[PDB]
Amino acid sequence: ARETETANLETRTDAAIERARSMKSASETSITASATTQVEALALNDTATELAKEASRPDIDVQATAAKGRQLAMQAMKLLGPWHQEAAARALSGTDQDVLDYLRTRWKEANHNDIRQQIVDLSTQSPYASVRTAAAEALNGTPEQIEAFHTTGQYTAGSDDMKVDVARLANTGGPGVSQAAKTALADGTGKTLATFLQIGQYGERLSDEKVVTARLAETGSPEVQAAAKIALAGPPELLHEFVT
């Protein structure tokens, strides 16, 4: 009876490992594709900057610029958000002089509108009261103040709250999280603290979780065993759920 139970457990587990194997690979593929798209979008903004300089350059050429500008607009409607999609469509539907104008000014306006967009988002979405309030104030100031908050002000405003959150993680998470939290805390830069709390700590818990699962996989009871091995074989989502 005991041999039968063992044989049946091993058979089911092996099948689960192969399925878990497949899911992990599928997840990685989607992640890579997403990252690729973001890179192209960033590259597009750099291209736009160079085109904006040429068009307004006093000695302009002959529609040559508009041709490049139309290509820029076409890409904008695929890689960038609504602010650029609208500006791009309007430029593309017009004449060379409108593409002239698009490159010179509203490209920049579309970026500005997006930044103001997230200042608005911060005023209600941010976990930090100091950031929500300060964002609301920045929103009603000058264009320079709106962008300034996005670039540095939000990291300063929430600095006091972030330090507390990092300090908490330092004294409760596992070796990975604790190690990283202490580094971020010791530095003290608002951007450093934000990076850790926003994404850094998540990479660290996965590390801590794998160690816990790895142990159970070897020294735990039979069914626990099997479950732990499957969790290691599959996506991060399975690892997290298993440990919890």
Partner: protein, 49 residues
Amino acid sequence: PLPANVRADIVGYWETGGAGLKAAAEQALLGGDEAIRKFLADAPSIQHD
């Protein structure tokens, strides 16, 4: 001659049409008046495809 808003109508097709009409729309939108005339001439057949 082309309609004053011919490019705007083509962008419309680009946004909502199928792969064929969309790709054809890009050529008209990126090129000049000749590219537009070619698109319009074929568009009735491209939508069918």
